[PDB]
PDB file of C-alpha atoms and ligand atoms in Angstrom:
ATOM      1  CA  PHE B 231       0.000   0.000   0.000  1.00 10.65           C
ATOM      2  CA  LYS B 232       1.727   3.126  -1.308  1.00  8.77           C
ATOM      3  CA  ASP B 233      -0.295   5.742  -3.211  1.00 10.11           C
ATOM      4  CA  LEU B 234       2.842   7.885  -3.645  1.00  7.63           C
ATOM      5  CA  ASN B 235       3.381   7.681  -7.427  1.00  8.23           C
ATOM      6  CA  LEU B 236       6.846   6.164  -6.973  1.00  9.97           C
ATOM      7  CA  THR B 237       9.537   5.950  -9.670  1.00 10.92           C
ATOM      8  CA  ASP B 238      11.013   2.716 -11.006  1.00 10.42           C
ATOM      9  CA  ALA B 239      14.268   3.579  -9.250  1.00 12.23           C
ATOM     10  CA  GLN B 240      12.249   4.085  -6.071  1.00 11.28           C
ATOM     11  CA  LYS B 241      10.440   0.735  -6.127  1.00  9.61           C
ATOM     12  CA  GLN B 242      13.745  -1.108  -6.470  1.00  9.24           C
ATOM     13  CA  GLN B 243      15.564   0.998  -3.895  1.00  9.81           C
ATOM     14  CA  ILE B 244      12.678  -0.174  -1.693  1.00  9.79           C
ATOM     15  CA  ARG B 245      13.230  -3.860  -2.462  1.00 10.39           C
ATOM     16  CA  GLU B 246      16.898  -3.371  -1.523  1.00  7.56           C
ATOM     17  CA  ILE B 247      15.586  -1.960   1.771  1.00 11.67           C
ATOM     18  CA  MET B 248      13.045  -4.697   2.524  1.00 11.14           C
ATOM     19  CA  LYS B 249      15.881  -7.219   2.177  1.00 11.52           C
ATOM     20  CA  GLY B 250      18.405  -6.143   4.817  1.00 10.52           C
ATOM     21  CA  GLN B 251      15.522  -5.873   7.271  1.00  9.51           C
ATOM     22  CA  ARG B 252      13.480  -8.319   5.442  1.00  9.46           C
ATOM     23  CA  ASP B 253      16.404 -10.219   7.020  1.00 10.55           C
ATOM     24  CA  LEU B 254       7.827 -19.480  17.673  1.00  6.66           C
ATOM     25  CA  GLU B 255       7.988 -21.170  21.046  1.00  8.21           C
ATOM     26  CA  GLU B 256       6.778 -17.705  22.067  1.00  4.43           C
ATOM     27  CA  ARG B 257       3.188 -18.484  21.025  1.00  3.45           C
ATOM     28  CA  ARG B 258       3.737 -21.960  22.512  1.00  2.64           C
ATOM     29  CA  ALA B 259       4.394 -20.407  25.927  1.00  2.00           C
ATOM     30  CA  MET B 260       1.427 -18.098  25.724  1.00  2.00           C
ATOM     31  CA  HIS B 261      -0.712 -21.008  24.615  1.00  2.00           C
ATOM     32  CA  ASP B 262       0.368 -22.893  27.754  1.00  2.00           C
ATOM     33  CA  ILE B 263      -0.440 -19.864  29.910  1.00  2.00           C
ATOM     34  CA  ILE B 264      -3.941 -19.514  28.502  1.00  2.00           C
ATOM     35  CA  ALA B 265      -4.753 -23.240  28.583  1.00  2.00           C
ATOM     36  CA  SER B 266      -3.687 -23.868  32.180  1.00  2.00           C
ATOM     37  CA  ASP B 267      -6.040 -24.790  34.958  1.00  2.00           C
ATOM     38  CA  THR B 268      -4.803 -21.781  36.968  1.00  2.00           C
ATOM     39  CA  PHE B 269      -3.520 -18.337  35.963  1.00  2.00           C
ATOM     40  CA  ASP B 270       0.111 -17.956  37.030  1.00  2.00           C
ATOM     41  CA  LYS B 271       0.827 -14.206  37.099  1.00  2.00           C
ATOM     42  CA  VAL B 272       4.565 -14.531  37.753  1.00  2.00           C
ATOM     43  CA  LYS B 273       4.891 -16.976  34.816  1.00  2.00           C
ATOM     44  CA  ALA B 274       2.831 -14.571  32.670  1.00  2.00           C
ATOM     45  CA  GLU B 275       4.976 -11.619  33.689  1.00  2.00           C
ATOM     46  CA  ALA B 276       8.058 -13.500  32.523  1.00  2.00           C
ATOM     47  CA  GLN B 277       6.489 -14.326  29.155  1.00  2.00           C
ATOM     48  CA  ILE B 278       5.625 -10.639  28.694  1.00  2.00           C
ATOM     49  CA  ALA B 279       9.199  -9.668  29.525  1.00  2.00           C
ATOM     50  CA  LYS B 280      10.557 -12.160  26.962  1.00  2.00           C
ATOM     51  CA  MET B 281       8.095 -10.831  24.358  1.00  2.00           C
ATOM     52  CA  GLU B 282       9.557  -7.338  24.995  1.00  2.00           C
ATOM     53  CA  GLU B 283      12.895  -8.501  23.474  1.00  2.00           C
ATOM     54  CA  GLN B 284      11.348  -9.599  20.174  1.00  2.00           C
ATOM     55  CA  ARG B 285       9.064  -6.581  20.021  1.00  2.00           C
ATOM     56  CA  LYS B 286      12.153  -4.399  20.449  1.00  2.00           C
ATOM     57  CA  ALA B 287      13.907  -6.103  17.530  1.00  2.00           C
ATOM     58  CA  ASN B 288      10.790  -5.998  15.399  1.00  2.00           C
ATOM     59  CA  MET B 289       9.984  -2.347  16.085  1.00  2.00           C
ATOM     60  CA  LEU B 290      13.588  -1.277  15.464  1.00  2.00           C
ATOM     61  CA  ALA B 291      13.502  -3.127  12.124  1.00  2.00           C
ATOM     62  CA  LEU B 292      10.170  -1.623  11.084  1.00  2.00           C
ATOM     63  CA  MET B 293      11.123   1.901  12.049  1.00  2.00           C
ATOM     64  CA  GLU B 294      14.575   1.799  10.487  1.00  2.00           C
ATOM     65  CA  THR B 295      13.092   0.404   7.270  1.00  2.00           C
ATOM     66  CA  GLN B 296      10.415   3.095   7.222  1.00  2.00           C
ATOM     67  CA  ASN B 297      12.950   5.847   7.884  1.00  2.00           C
ATOM     68  CA  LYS B 298      15.030   4.711   4.915  1.00  2.00           C
ATOM     69  CA  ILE B 299      11.918   4.565   2.737  1.00  2.00           C
ATOM     70  CA  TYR B 300      11.064   8.124   3.772  1.00  2.00           C
ATOM     71  CA  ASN B 301      14.515   9.458   2.965  1.00  2.00           C
ATOM     72  CA  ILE B 302      14.403   8.358  -0.652  1.00  2.00           C
ATOM     73  CA  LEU B 303      11.175  10.338  -1.129  1.00  2.00           C
ATOM     74  CA  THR B 304      10.742  13.773  -2.692  1.00  2.00           C
ATOM     75  CA  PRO B 305       9.430  16.705  -0.630  1.00  2.00           C
ATOM     76  CA  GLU B 306       6.014  16.139  -2.260  1.00  2.00           C
ATOM     77  CA  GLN B 307       6.078  12.399  -1.600  1.00  2.00           C
ATOM     78  CA  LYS B 308       7.196  13.019   2.005  1.00  2.00           C
ATOM     79  CA  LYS B 309       4.220  15.287   2.670  1.00  2.00           C
ATOM     80  CA  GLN B 310       2.026  12.503   1.255  1.00  2.00           C
ATOM     81  CA  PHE B 311       3.786   9.858   3.336  1.00  2.00           C
ATOM     82  CA  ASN B 312       3.235  11.968   6.451  1.00  2.00           C
ATOM     83  CA  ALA B 313      -0.439  12.596   5.691  1.00  2.00           C
ATOM     84  CA  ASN B 314      -0.930   8.876   5.032  1.00  2.00           C
ATOM     85  CA  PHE B 315       0.784   8.088   8.334  1.00  2.00           C
ATOM     86  CA  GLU B 316      -1.826  10.165  10.233  1.00  2.00           C
ATOM     87  CA  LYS B 317      -4.685   8.001   8.912  1.00  2.00           C
ATOM     88  CA  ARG B 318      -3.546   4.370   9.134  1.00  2.00           C
TER      89      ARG B 318
ATOM     90  CA  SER F  50     -13.104 -20.268  14.349  1.00  2.00           C
ATOM     91  CA  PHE F  51     -11.705 -18.235  17.250  1.00  2.00           C
ATOM     92  CA  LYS F  52     -14.990 -16.819  18.559  1.00  2.00           C
ATOM     93  CA  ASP F  53     -17.772 -19.040  17.140  1.00  2.00           C
ATOM     94  CA  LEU F  54     -17.723 -21.980  19.626  1.00  2.00           C
ATOM     95  CA  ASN F  55     -21.450 -22.743  20.359  1.00  2.00           C
ATOM     96  CA  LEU F  56     -21.453 -20.951  23.709  1.00  2.00           C
ATOM     97  CA  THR F  57     -24.327 -21.810  26.033  1.00  2.00           C
ATOM     98  CA  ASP F  58     -26.450 -19.148  27.724  1.00  2.00           C
ATOM     99  CA  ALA F  59     -24.495 -19.709  30.938  1.00  2.00           C
ATOM    100  CA  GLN F  60     -21.167 -19.308  29.178  1.00  2.00           C
ATOM    101  CA  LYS F  61     -22.497 -16.135  27.606  1.00  2.00           C
ATOM    102  CA  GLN F  62     -23.250 -14.722  31.055  1.00  2.00           C
ATOM    103  CA  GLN F  63     -19.973 -15.960  32.497  1.00  2.00           C
ATOM    104  CA  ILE F  64     -17.986 -14.262  29.750  1.00  2.00           C
ATOM    105  CA  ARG F  65     -19.995 -11.084  30.295  1.00  2.00           C
ATOM    106  CA  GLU F  66     -18.993 -11.146  33.940  1.00  2.00           C
ATOM    107  CA  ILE F  67     -15.295 -11.825  33.264  1.00  2.00           C
ATOM    108  CA  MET F  68     -14.989  -9.001  30.729  1.00  2.00           C
ATOM    109  CA  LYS F  69     -16.215  -6.336  33.159  1.00  2.00           C
ATOM    110  CA  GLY F  70     -13.796  -7.681  35.746  1.00  2.00           C
ATOM    111  CA  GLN F  71     -10.956  -7.022  33.238  1.00  2.00           C
ATOM    112  CA  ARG F  72     -12.356  -4.350  30.859  1.00  2.00           C
ATOM    113  CA  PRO F  73      -5.299   3.565  21.032  1.00  2.00           C
ATOM    114  CA  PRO F  74      -2.162   5.323  22.388  1.00  2.00           C
ATOM    115  CA  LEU F  75      -1.679   8.245  20.012  1.00  2.00           C
ATOM    116  CA  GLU F  76       1.231   9.842  21.857  1.00  2.00           C
ATOM    117  CA  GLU F  77       3.125   6.617  21.190  1.00  2.00           C
ATOM    118  CA  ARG F  78       2.382   6.792  17.446  1.00  2.00           C
ATOM    119  CA  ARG F  79       3.373  10.455  17.248  1.00  2.00           C
ATOM    120  CA  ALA F  80       6.776   9.512  18.635  1.00  2.00           C
ATOM    121  CA  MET F  81       7.167   6.696  16.095  1.00  2.00           C
ATOM    122  CA  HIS F  82       6.347   9.323  13.460  1.00  2.00           C
ATOM    123  CA  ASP F  83       9.076  11.632  14.672  1.00  2.00           C
ATOM    124  CA  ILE F  84      11.648   8.814  14.419  1.00  2.00           C
ATOM    125  CA  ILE F  85      10.632   7.719  10.924  1.00  2.00           C
ATOM    126  CA  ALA F  86      10.290  11.194   9.383  1.00  2.00           C
ATOM    127  CA  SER F  87      13.771  12.424  10.332  1.00  2.00           C
ATOM    128  CA  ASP F  88      16.662  12.643   7.902  1.00  2.00           C
ATOM    129  CA  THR F  89      18.569   9.996   9.941  1.00  2.00           C
ATOM    130  CA  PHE F  90      17.581   6.888  11.904  1.00  2.00           C
ATOM    131  CA  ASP F  91      18.367   7.525  15.583  1.00  2.00           C
ATOM    132  CA  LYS F  92      18.586   4.106  17.217  1.00  2.00           C
ATOM    133  CA  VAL F  93      19.044   5.365  20.787  1.00  2.00           C
ATOM    134  CA  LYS F  94      15.923   7.518  20.615  1.00  2.00           C
ATOM    135  CA  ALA F  95      14.093   4.637  18.880  1.00  2.00           C
ATOM    136  CA  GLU F  96      14.972   2.294  21.758  1.00  2.00           C
ATOM    137  CA  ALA F  97      13.790   4.898  24.273  1.00  2.00           C
ATOM    138  CA  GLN F  98      10.496   5.321  22.449  1.00  2.00           C
ATOM    139  CA  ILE F  99       9.948   1.558  22.178  1.00  2.00           C
ATOM    140  CA  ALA F 100      10.613   1.078  25.873  1.00  2.00           C
ATOM    141  CA  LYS F 101       8.471   3.983  26.986  1.00  2.00           C
ATOM    142  CA  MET F 102       5.065   2.263  27.424  1.00  2.00           C
ATOM    143  CA  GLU F 103       6.528  -0.923  28.931  1.00  2.00           C
ATOM    144  CA  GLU F 104       4.476  -0.762  32.126  1.00  2.00           C
ATOM    145  CA  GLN F 105       1.170   0.009  30.434  1.00  2.00           C
ATOM    146  CA  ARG F 106       1.882  -2.793  27.962  1.00  2.00           C
ATOM    147  CA  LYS F 107       2.519  -5.115  30.942  1.00  2.00           C
ATOM    148  CA  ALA F 108      -0.777  -4.264  32.644  1.00  2.00           C
ATOM    149  CA  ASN F 109      -2.733  -4.656  29.422  1.00  2.00           C
ATOM    150  CA  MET F 110      -1.136  -7.965  28.475  1.00  2.00           C
ATOM    151  CA  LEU F 111      -1.579  -9.364  31.998  1.00  2.00           C
ATOM    152  CA  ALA F 112      -5.238  -8.368  31.959  1.00  2.00           C
ATOM    153  CA  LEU F 113      -5.663  -9.924  28.519  1.00  2.00           C
ATOM    154  CA  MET F 114      -3.954 -13.187  29.448  1.00  2.00           C
ATOM    155  CA  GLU F 115      -5.870 -13.555  32.706  1.00  2.00           C
ATOM    156  CA  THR F 116      -9.142 -12.896  30.863  1.00  2.00           C
ATOM    157  CA  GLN F 117      -8.383 -15.533  28.201  1.00  2.00           C
ATOM    158  CA  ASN F 118      -7.355 -18.149  30.760  1.00  2.00           C
ATOM    159  CA  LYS F 119     -10.639 -17.569  32.643  1.00  2.00           C
ATOM    160  CA  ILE F 120     -12.705 -18.021  29.454  1.00  2.00           C
ATOM    161  CA  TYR F 121     -10.715 -21.073  28.402  1.00  2.00           C
ATOM    162  CA  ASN F 122     -11.605 -22.661  31.697  1.00  2.00           C
ATOM    163  CA  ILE F 123     -15.392 -22.267  31.360  1.00  2.00           C
ATOM    164  CA  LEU F 124     -15.236 -24.219  28.081  1.00  2.00           C
ATOM    165  CA  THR F 125     -16.212 -27.871  27.824  1.00  2.00           C
ATOM    166  CA  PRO F 126     -13.557 -30.341  26.669  1.00  2.00           C
ATOM    167  CA  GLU F 127     -14.947 -30.465  23.129  1.00  2.00           C
ATOM    168  CA  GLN F 128     -14.775 -26.655  22.975  1.00  2.00           C
ATOM    169  CA  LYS F 129     -11.279 -26.607  24.455  1.00  2.00           C
ATOM    170  CA  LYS F 130     -10.220 -29.054  21.749  1.00  2.00           C
ATOM    171  CA  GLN F 131     -11.743 -26.821  19.050  1.00  2.00           C
ATOM    172  CA  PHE F 132     -10.120 -23.702  20.489  1.00  2.00           C
ATOM    173  CA  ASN F 133      -6.708 -25.334  20.888  1.00  2.00           C
ATOM    174  CA  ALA F 134      -6.780 -26.727  17.325  1.00  2.00           C
ATOM    175  CA  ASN F 135      -7.668 -23.320  15.889  1.00  2.00           C
ATOM    176  CA  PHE F 136      -4.916 -21.823  18.075  1.00  2.00           C
ATOM    177  CA  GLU F 137      -2.272 -24.050  16.466  1.00  2.00           C
ATOM    178  CA  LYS F 138      -3.377 -22.862  12.987  1.00  2.00           C
ATOM    179  CA  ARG F 139      -3.209 -19.091  13.557  1.00  2.00           C
TER     180      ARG F 139
HETATM  181 CL1  LIG D 178       0.938 -22.429  19.856  1.00  2.00          CL
HETATM  182 CL1  LIG D 179       1.304  10.168  14.176  1.00  2.00          CL
HETATM  183 ZN1  LIG D 180      -0.121 -24.366  20.817  1.00  2.00          ZN
HETATM  184 ZN1  LIG D 181       4.387 -20.106  39.095  1.00  2.00          ZN
HETATM  185 ZN1  LIG D 182      20.827  -1.377   9.598  1.00  2.00          ZN
HETATM  186 ZN1  LIG D 183     -30.930 -17.961  25.280  1.00  2.00          ZN
HETATM  187 ZN1  LIG D 184      -3.115  11.614  25.310  1.00  2.00          ZN
HETATM  188 ZN1  LIG D 185       1.931  11.947  12.908  1.00  2.00          ZN
HETATM  189 ZN1  LIG D 186       6.426  15.407  15.963  1.00  2.00          ZN
HETATM  190 ZN1  LIG D 187      19.855  16.584   9.014  1.00  2.00          ZN
HETATM  191 ZN1  LIG D 188      12.198  -1.525  31.138  1.00  2.00          ZN
HETATM  192 ZN1  LIG D 189       8.010  -4.273  35.632  1.00  2.00          ZN
HETATM  193 ZN1  LIG D 190      -7.793 -11.108  38.835  1.00  2.00          ZN
END
């Protein structure tokens, strides 16, 4: 989703980008927490803390990728990127 | 799937109860927007931003997990089996 009228050079600069940072026993542990007879808060706090590490890595990847995408855009395309960002 | 499990009247009430007993952060998004729309990627400020709502995320996730555990446990074994099998597929 990118209604920015992007140039051929741009699309392929973008592929280059979504390849460095285009580069699950988590959901198993949460499954075990939900499906247990009893709710173990301390065990759930530790799962949340471990999820924080992957969220960190994922958010850093997303944001770095998006920052590089932004900084190949024209002033006009940047304004449009920013407006689009306010709505999704 | 996920939410269509042939809940009985009683289960419908019991879920109603649970969900009162455990009930969009724009300021967070604004700060993501400042990091993305800058002429450089500032990792140290990005890490600060990401970490900022840790405690609120903890409370919300703990509430969510306790709520889901409580609803799992009012299910019959056939419904638990359905829910678990769907869970593996997500
Ligand atoms: Cl799982
Ligand atoms: Cl924003
Ligand atoms: Zn599972
Ligand atoms: Zn324990
Ligand atoms: Zn990098
Ligand atoms: Zn009825
Ligand atoms: Zn506010
Ligand atoms: Zn914004
Ligand atoms: Zn700002
Ligand atoms: Zn500068
Ligand atoms: Zn912390
Ligand atoms: Zn804490
Ligand atoms: Zn409680």
